[PDB]
Amino acid sequence: RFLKVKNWETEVVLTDTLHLKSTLETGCTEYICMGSIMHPSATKDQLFPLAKEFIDQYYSSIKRFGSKAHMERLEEVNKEIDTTSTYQLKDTELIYGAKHAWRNASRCVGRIQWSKLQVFDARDCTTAHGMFNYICNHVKYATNKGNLRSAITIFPQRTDGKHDFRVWNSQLIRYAGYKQPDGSTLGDPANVQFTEICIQQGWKPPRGRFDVLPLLLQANGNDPELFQIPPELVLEVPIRHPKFEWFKDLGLKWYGLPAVSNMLLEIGGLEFSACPFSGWYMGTEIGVRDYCDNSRYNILEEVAKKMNLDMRKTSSLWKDQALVEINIAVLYSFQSDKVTIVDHHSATESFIKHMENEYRCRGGCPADWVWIVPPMSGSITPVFHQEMLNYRLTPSFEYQPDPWNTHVWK
Amino acid sequence: CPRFLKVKNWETEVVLTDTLHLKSTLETGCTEYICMGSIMHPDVATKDQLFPLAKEFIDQYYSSIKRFGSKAHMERLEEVNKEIDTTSTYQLKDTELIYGAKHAWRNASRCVGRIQWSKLQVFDARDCTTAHGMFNYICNHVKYATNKGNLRSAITIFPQRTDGKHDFRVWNSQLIRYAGYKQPDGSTLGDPANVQFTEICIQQGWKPPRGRFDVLPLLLQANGNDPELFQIPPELVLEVPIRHPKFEWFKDLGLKWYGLPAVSNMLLEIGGLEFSACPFSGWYMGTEIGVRDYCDNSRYNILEEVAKKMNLDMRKTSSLWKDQALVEINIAVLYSFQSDKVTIVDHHSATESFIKHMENEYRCRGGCPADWVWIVPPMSGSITPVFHQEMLNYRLTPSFEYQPDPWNTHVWK
Numbered sequence: 001r002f003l004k005v006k007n008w009e010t011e012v013v014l015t016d017t018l019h020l021k022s023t024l025e026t027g028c029t030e031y032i033c034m035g036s037i038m039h040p041s042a043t044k045d046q047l048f049p050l051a052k053e054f055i056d057q058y059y060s061s062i063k064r065f066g067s068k069a070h071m072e073r074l075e076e077v078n079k080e081i082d083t084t085s086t087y088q089l090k091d092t093e094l095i096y097g098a099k100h101a102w103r104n105a106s107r108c109v110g111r112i113q114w115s116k117l118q119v120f121d122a123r124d125c126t127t128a129h130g131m132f133n134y135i136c137n138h139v140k141y142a143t144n145k146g147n148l149r150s151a152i153t154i155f156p157q158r159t160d161g162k163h164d165f166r167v168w169n170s171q172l173i174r175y176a177g178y179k180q181p182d183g184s185t186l187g188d189p190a191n192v193q194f195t196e197i198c199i200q201q202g203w204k205p206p207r208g209r210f211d212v213l214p215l216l217l218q219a220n221g222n223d224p225e226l227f228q229i230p231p232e233l234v235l236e237v238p239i240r241h242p243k244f245e246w247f248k249d250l251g252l253k254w255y256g257l258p259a260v261s262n263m264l265l266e267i268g269g270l271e272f273s274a275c276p277f278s279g280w281y282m283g284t285e286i287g288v289r290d291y292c293d294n295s296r297y298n299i300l301e302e303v304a305k306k307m308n309l310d311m312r313k314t315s316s317l318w319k320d321q322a323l324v325e326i327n328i329a330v331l332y333s334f335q336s337d338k339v340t341i342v343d344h345h346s347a348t349e350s351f352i353k354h355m356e357n358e359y360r361c362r363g364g365c366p367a368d369w370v371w372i373v374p375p376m377s378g379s380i381t382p383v384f385h386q387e388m389l390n391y392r393l394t395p396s397f398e399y400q401p402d403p404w405n406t407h408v409w410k
Numbered sequence: 411c412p413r414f415l416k417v418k419n420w421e422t423e424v425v426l427t428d429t430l431h432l433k434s435t436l437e438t439g440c441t442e443y444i445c446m447g448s449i450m451h452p453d454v455a456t457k458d459q460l461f462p463l464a465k466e467f468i469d470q471y472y473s474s475i476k477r478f479g480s481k482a483h484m485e486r487l488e489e490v491n492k493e494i495d496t497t498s499t500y501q502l503k504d505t506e507l508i509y510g511a512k513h514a515w516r517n518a519s520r521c522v523g524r525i526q527w528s529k530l531q532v533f534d535a536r537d538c539t540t541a542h543g544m545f546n547y548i549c550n551h552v553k554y555a556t557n558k559g560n561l562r563s564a565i566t567i568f569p570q571r572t573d574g575k576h577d578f579r580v581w582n583s584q585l586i587r588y589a590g591y592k593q594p595d596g597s598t599l600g601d602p603a604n605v606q607f608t609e610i611c612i613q614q615g616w617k618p619p620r621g622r623f624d625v626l627p628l629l630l631q632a633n634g635n636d637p638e639l640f641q642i643p644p645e646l647v648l649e650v651p652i653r654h655p656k657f658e659w660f661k662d663l664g665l666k667w668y669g670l671p672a673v674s675n676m677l678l679e680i681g682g683l684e685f686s687a688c689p690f691s692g693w694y695m696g697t698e699i700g701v702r703d704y705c706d707n708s709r710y711n712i713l714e715e716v717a718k719k720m721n722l723d724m725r726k727t728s729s730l731w732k733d734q735a736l737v738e739i740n741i742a743v744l745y746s747f748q749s750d751k752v753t754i755v756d757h758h759s760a761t762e763s764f765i766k767h768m769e770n771e772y773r774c775r776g777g778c779p780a781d782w783v784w785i786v787p788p789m790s791g792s793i794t795p796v797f798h799q800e801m802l803n804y805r806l807t808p809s810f811e812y813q814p815d816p817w818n819t820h821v822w823k
């Protein structure tokens with residue numbers, strides 16, 4: 001069936017047909033919906049029709065379905081899944097698969113940009129040193145002195161599971177987290193385990209509040225190897241407030257490049273277990289989640305302190321107030337430093353416009369309301385009132401297990 | 411379909427285990443291939459359909475009172491069975507009616523207030539025959555529930571559906587709302603959400619004050635007859651003028667709201683019986699007024715004007731001027747209600763209470779259906795605990811359900 005979705009602020013209805021192409025499960029059933037569950041729990045035979053499907057839609061996107069090039073490519077790929085138990089994507093197929101995996105990313109509010117993706121082929125990589133070189137170039141290229149650019153670096157695909165390339169850092173740039181004897185936590189509490197793994201691998205912690213973690217890179221299934229990203233490549237922003245001059249006295253900085261490196265890019269049944277990818281920040285990512293989550297940098301109490309706010313009852317909304325000012329400061333700081341950043345108002349607008357685009361040109365657009373709606377001021381952004389359908393289109397980015405839980409050390 | 415599903419809180423690491431989902435009934439609208447989790451809304455029952463629905467609810471009731479399989483239990487089954495067989499329907503005992511209503515609330519995935527589910531005053535209005543009588547019942551409901559500002563949750567249940575052509579309906583989507591008036595120049599006065607309903611009332615004979623905050627009359631339908639207009643006595647409608655603990659100019663905005671939130675357009679289903687008129691009411695979460703009623707674009711849209719008197723940079727959206735005004739407005743709403751000692755809960759306290767409720771439910775009941783999209787507050791989501799809480803959504807019965815707007819289905823006499 002065709003399926004409709006309504007905006008309840010504008011009463012616009014859209015018709016979704018694209019969902020007829022999904023296959024991967026959502027995690028729901030008729031009886032139970034798991035829309036708020038963050039993670040719902042190949043051979044010659046399995047791989048080919050997946051390969052067939054992806055090739056088919058590639059040659060369908062470039063208006064050559066059934067062409068000679070297409071037919072032979074199907075043969076070329078079949079012959080190769082026989083005699084290697086896998087196959088290699090053409091360069092044009094790599095780029096297309098990467099952009100469409102971003103276009104299919106239900107949880108990403110930035111997808112208006114999906115076709116502007118710089119794709120770095122690192123499938124010739126063989127070592128962690130190789131990986132580090134590739135990642136440094138990625139970082140430098142995508143940072144671009146504050147004028148950020150979207151990029152993905154794709155390393156060798158999985159073969160047998162034993163010989164997997166992995167970036168072990170969940171993201172390319174993060175701040176260390178230190179477990180104090182006195183119970184509390186220095187740095188970023190979300191990372192503390194990873195930070196400990198780096199110390200245990202030989203990293204020398206400065207034990208500051210904002211210590212860029214080293215890269216931990218695994219190439220072809222071997223022990224990961226530590227590498228320090230050259231600091232000149234790691235662009236950072238001091239957070240100040242345009243009215244509160246005491247705000248700089250808080251000591252807050254964040255990095256400019258958001259870059260996710262723990263995910264699995266899947267194209268034509270092939271699995272790229274290492275594919276760090278980056279864009280630019282929506283302010284709330286930093287101002288709300290990183291800084292204000294109780295399990296994170298947790299500064300709300302501190303900020304409300306300097307704002308002299310009455311903090312005895314919840315109903316004074318002191319937490320709310322402090323939150324808004326923290327985010328004003330983050331948006332201000334990046335803007336002041338000509339570092340690319342988007343506010344949640346602008347970003348959500350863009351995504352509603354992008355949805356329109358996809359429904360019109362593509363017949364639907366899988367979106368995850370839970371993730372798309374910003375973590376503050378929800379209903380005063382336009383996607384709150386926007387019904388969305390969620391379904392899994394492929395190529396996609398998938399979660400994969402943390403490497404330190406599957407690795408056989410040496 | 412697995413026997414034990416697990417949900418995680420990502421802030422606290424707490425994992426909970428859900429078994430109650432096994433007792434799921436109707437569809438969510440979701441499938442293996444697609445999720446309708448953010449979709450707002452994804453001729454009677456036969457004898458054969460009603461029996462297993464009745465026995466289901468009846469078994470459940472005698473299970474709750476720890477008399478499952480007892481004599482009284484089998485006797486009740488046999489009596490209901492007989493009644494459905496002969497009269498094509500059946501009547502609920504008062505005890506069952508009351509259990510059923512509290513459980514429809516308990517089962518309501520979109521309600522963050524469910525920690526109060528067992529404190530519910532049920533008014534049995536199934537002896538009602540006329541709209542005048544419906545008006546009487548609803549007035550008593552409002553007075554009891556309002557309680558001079560010390561609100562109390564209540565539901566009034568009117569007679570169940572019979573053939574389909576004799577439904578009792580409150581035509582008001584809620585008991586107390588403000589009129590909306592479309593103007594010739596396309597502007598709107600009052601509450602822009604209620605324009606359609608306001609025009610219906612005016613047609614039915616209402617003389618509109620054409621104001622910003624005009625409490626609508628009730629439009630009531632008894633036994634499938636044409637609805638009738640009644641004016642709620644003003645002394646029964648408790649109201650709160652909005653002021654700010656700091657900004658003395660806030661009161662100059664001329665804003666106020668009513669104290670009693672009371673949903674009247676839903677259908678209550680118990681043991682396969684359909685109660686098409688069952689107005690129920692509790693108390694407000696501050697954000698319902700301060701964020702949605704006051705700041706939704708298609709509603710009272712006061713953000714711009716509030717921002718103006720706050721003197722905020724309104725040219726750059728990255729100044730977050732909207733966000734700044736929103737907090738202050740919800741600060742004023744909460745403040746105004748507390749001062750007039752009218753019961754209201756802030757989104758922080760409510761969501762925390764609900765996490766404690768949900769945890770208790772998992773403990774004693776093996777689950778607690780919840781609709782994350784509705785449960786998370788429309789401001790400051792992530793700084794409230796429910797944001798980080800994985801939930802599972804499924805339909806347990808007894809339940810509140812949506813039903814068509816009656817003006818779209820009514821056959822005019």
Ligand code: HEM
Nearest residue numbers: 102105107108109110113150152277278279280281282397
């Ligand atoms: C270019 C600017 C971009 C913006 C403003 C943006 C915005 C966002 C935000 C705010 C999130 C939520 C992150 C979180 O809550 O952890 C997200 C998620 C995501 N984005 Fe984007 N994004 C951008 C670029 C990209 C790019 C370049 C890719 C891939 C090539 C991408 C793919 C994804 C994926 C797969 C997720 C899901 C992350 C997860 O599941 O943990 N995005 N995006």
Ligand code: HEM
Nearest residue numbers: 515518520521522523526563564690691692693694695810
């Ligand atoms: C006692 C205080 C209560 C509080 C604080 C509370 C809170 C809320 C809130 C904030 C919502 C979202 C409303 C919206 O955005 O439209 C809601 C929805 C709902 N509540 Fe409660 N509620 C309370 C009592 C009740 C009672 C007594 C019942 C039924 C017996 C009930 C059943 C429901 C239902 C069925 C919904 C979904 C409404 C819909 O689908 O439009 N609630 N509640």
Ligand SMILES: CNCC#Cc1cc(F)cc(CCc2cc(C)cc(N)n2)c1
Nearest residue numbers: 171174258259260277278279280281282
């Ligand atoms: C799954 N939740 C835990 C987390 C996390 C996280 C941490 C970081 F240090 C950076 C990002 C970046 C997320 C992101 C990715 C992209 C491509 C763009 C963007 N704006 N944000 C996420």
Ligand SMILES: CNCC#Cc1cc(F)cc(CCc2cc(C)cc(N)n2)c1
Nearest residue numbers: 584587671672673690691692693694695
């Ligand atoms: C379906 N979405 C549109 C709507 C609406 C609505 C309008 C109103 F004037 C009052 C309430 C109150 C909702 C509610 C019910 C109960 C029982 C408690 C509570 N706090 N809020 C809802």
Ligand SMILES: C[C@H](O)[C@H](O)[C@H]1CNc2nc(N)[nH]c(=O)c2N1
Nearest residue numbers: 036037038370371797798799800
């Ligand atoms: C349990 C729930 O799914 C979880 O808290 C989600 C909610 N929405 C989110 N939305 C974004 N953008 N990022 C997140 O990490 C989350 N977390």
Ligand SMILES: C[C@H](O)[C@H](O)[C@H]1CNc2nc(N)[nH]c(=O)c2N1
Nearest residue numbers: 384385386387448449450783784
């Ligand atoms: C499309 C989306 O489902 C819709 O805007 C929902 C979002 N969550 C909500 N949550 C509550 N409590 N009330 C609402 O009206 C809505 N609206």
Ligand SMILES: [Zn+2]
Nearest residue numbers: 028033440445
């Ligand atoms: Zn679902």
